Amino acid sequence: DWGYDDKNGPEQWSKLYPIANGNNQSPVDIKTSETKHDTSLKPISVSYNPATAKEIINVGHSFHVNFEDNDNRSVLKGGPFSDSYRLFQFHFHWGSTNEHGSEHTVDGVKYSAELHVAHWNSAKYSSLAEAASKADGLAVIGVLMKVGEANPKLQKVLDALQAIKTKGKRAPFTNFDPSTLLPSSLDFWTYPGSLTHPPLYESVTWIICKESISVSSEQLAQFRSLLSNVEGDNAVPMQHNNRPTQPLKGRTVRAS
Ligand SMILES: *CCS(=O)(=O)c1c(F)c(F)c(S(N)(=O)=O)c(F)c1NC1CCCCCCC1
Numbered sequence: 001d002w003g004y005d006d007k008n009g010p011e012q013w014s015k016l017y018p019i020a021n022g023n024n025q026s027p028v029d030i031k032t033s034e035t036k037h038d039t040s041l042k043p044i045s046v047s048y049n050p051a052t053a054k055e056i057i058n059v060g061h062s063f064h065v066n067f068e069d070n071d072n073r074s075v076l077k078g079g080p081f082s083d084s085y086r087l088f089q090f091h092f093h094w095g096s097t098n099e100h101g102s103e104h105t106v107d108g109v110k111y112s113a114e115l116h117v118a119h120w121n122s123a124k125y126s127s128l129a130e131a132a133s134k135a136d137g138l139a140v141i142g143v144l145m146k147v148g149e150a151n152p153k154l155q156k157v158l159d160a161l162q163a164i165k166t167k168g169k170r171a172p173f174t175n176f177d178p179s180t181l182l183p184s185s186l187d188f189w190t191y192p193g194s195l196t197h198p199p200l201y202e203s204v205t206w207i208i209c210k211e212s213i214s215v216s217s218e219q220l221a222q223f224r225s226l227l228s229n230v231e232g233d234n235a236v237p238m239q240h241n242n243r244p245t246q247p248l249k250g251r252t253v254r255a256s
């Protein structure tokens with residue numbers, strides 16, 4: 001029902017999802033002069049099992065890669081967390097132009113796209129569906145993607161998109177460790193926030209990497225060539241899916 005278009009996009013979401021105007025909404029601009037270093041943060045540790053890669057799915061507004069989440073084979077730990085979070089998905093956001101496709105910004109600087117690697121709290125909760133609405137339920141690593149050289153690490157993913165061109169299509173996507181997509185250093189910022197699209201629950205601990213990764217102009221074009229319509233209907237490109245930044249409302253962004 002909601003989308004990213006003028007009629008149903010971010011500026012309209014608060015009508016059906018009032019929490020859009022809440023105190024812990026994402027994404028945010030990270031003003032580096034205002035970050036606070038927390039001596040209790042530990043380094044991030046990611047430990048993903050490539051055999052957990054399962055399927056790629058076109059969901060109309062975006063696409064994602066899911067990973068088997070029945071057990072703790074693939075986990076994020078460290079950082080601000082006291083226990084491990086289980087990997088379940090990764091996806092991207094992009095924009096209509098290379099100039100602004102990221103959701104998070106840094107000192108007002110907009111990147112071309114953004115990678116999200118999503119996990120849920122399997123220490124405290126027993127399912128993604130339980131964890132999704134809890135303040136401590138989800139942990140998402142964000143990586144800002146700077147347009148420039150083509151990124152070869154994206155290749156398996158981009159090559160798969162031909163199999164999921166229209167809304168609802170899905171295909172097997174196996175033997176893939178998405179830590180291969182992360183930057184070499186996992187220095188990061190963390191703040192309490194939300195899902196960036198409806199239902200916008202304030203359930204996400206964000207881990208935003210200090211270091212960016214690359215993406216080419218033509219790789220971004222491949223994202224925008226996915227279609228938001230169902231097969232047989234007239235082709236409608238998925239041109240953009242990034243939410244604008246939202247007020248900090250007194251939250252602190254912590255620096256590792
Ligand atoms: C196919 C991607 S998704 O499942 O629609 C999805 C998404 F596109 C996102 F942008 C987020 S975000 N930006 O806040 O990480 C996301 F979490 C997505 N997945 C969730 C699953 C977790 C709870 C269930 C309901 C909302 C979508």
Ligand SMILES: [Zn+2]
Binds near residue numbers: 091092093116196
């Ligand atoms: Zn996202």
